[PDB]
Write a protein that binds this ligand. Sequence first.
Ligand SMILES: O=P(O)(O)CP(=O)(O)O[C@@H]1[C@@H](OP(=O)(O)O)[C@H](OP(=O)(O)CP(=O)(O)O)[C@@H](OP(=O)(O)O)[C@H](OP(=O)(O)O)[C@@H]1OP(=O)(O)O
Ligand SMILES: Nc1ncnc2c1ncn2[C@@H]1O[C@H](COP(=O)(O)OP(=O)(O)O)[C@@H](O)[C@H]1O
Ligand SMILES: [Mg+2]
Ligand SMILES: [Mg+2]
Ligand SMILES: [Mg+2]
Length: 318
Amino acid sequence: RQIVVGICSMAKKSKSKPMKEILERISLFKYITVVVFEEEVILNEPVENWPLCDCLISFHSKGFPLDKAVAYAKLRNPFVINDLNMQYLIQDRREVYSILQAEGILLPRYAILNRDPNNPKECNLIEGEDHVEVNGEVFQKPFVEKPVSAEDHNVYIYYPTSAGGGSQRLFRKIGSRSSVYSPESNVRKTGSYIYEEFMPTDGTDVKVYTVGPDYAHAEARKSPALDGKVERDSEGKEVRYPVILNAREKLIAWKVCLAFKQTVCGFDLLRANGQSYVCDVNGFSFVKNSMKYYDDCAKILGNIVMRELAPQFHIPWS
Ligand SMILES: O=P(O)(O)CP(=O)(O)O[C@@H]1[C@@H](OP(=O)(O)O)[C@H](OP(=O)(O)CP(=O)(O)O)[C@@H](OP(=O)(O)O)[C@H](OP(=O)(O)O)[C@@H]1OP(=O)(O)O
Ligand SMILES: Nc1ncnc2c1ncn2[C@@H]1O[C@H](COP(=O)(O)OP(=O)(O)O)[C@@H](O)[C@H]1O
Ligand SMILES: [Mg+2]
Ligand SMILES: [Mg+2]
Ligand SMILES: [Mg+2]
């Protein structure tokens, strides 16, 4: 009898090129059958009617009913590749940062500004023309201001007077742009934010993609904060630069993968001041447009499934 690997995510993710490429390769495993849960079923059917699986690959994106996935996993008790309860915490930057700190992972110095919706005026924020003070902690410009919702990508950077003042407003990339300059020098006055020190990079972000704690692919892309113009190649794909992680960074990836219990996990590294700082943990994410990654990821996931489940299925596996 076959080991069933169930894929439970929104259709946009389940039918994505990287997903289809990887699932095709996982299916090549002799004792593995892949079942992709239909979006209509995920959204409209009670969990009791969802397909059975022995191993569940499931992850949140916009519109995904995480409560249902959690309930399904509790009902069927499959082997879970990416822990579902942790995906609530991944949606909250405050929770992400707390986990990183607890794990001895270097991250930007930061402070949380929580605003009670009823009292916007009763906050712990003092603003100077070249700095902010949050719960008593001072951040000189440049500093970064992030919505506490990790799903909210309206991240702002504030320039010091010596650099011309104003701000850089980042957003989910659309077409040719990932950010825009604003003459606004004052911080946002409604909502809750994390304020953090600006880490000076060479102008790129390092994007890391784990497949288990012992495998991580990295690449670099232009930081959206630079000027906001997206670099695209002859085919319309965003330009990426080769990266090889050093020993320290390979350990960071190991830590992030295990700490968040996300076998497949994307996160960002800022290479600054001779160190590497995690600034964002995104959970489930595949590398795009790398055939070798497709090969590696499918092989590792298949091996994880076989290692974990082959004994109870009485299947030979060395
Ligand atoms: O796919 P589209 O519609 O053309 C927009 P895009 O090309 O910017 O795709 C990005 C995707 O956005 P949506 O799926 O929400 O549209 C992100 O989605 P999200 O996680 O920021 C928001 P969602 O999960 O709610 O969709 C994330 O995709 P993924 O990480 O979910 O695979 C990201 O991936 P990276 O961060 O760059 O690795 C993708 O960027 P790219 O494909 O250029 O790499
Ligand atoms: N502390 C920081 N110092 C310098 N740049 C930062 C810092 N935090 C974020 N950035 C820049 O802003 C971008 C978006 O921030 P990030 O925390 O990755 O949010 P998102 O969840 O929207 O991707 C990063 O890729 C990086 O270029
Ligand atoms: Mg097969
Ligand atoms: Mg990021
Ligand atoms: Mg993020």
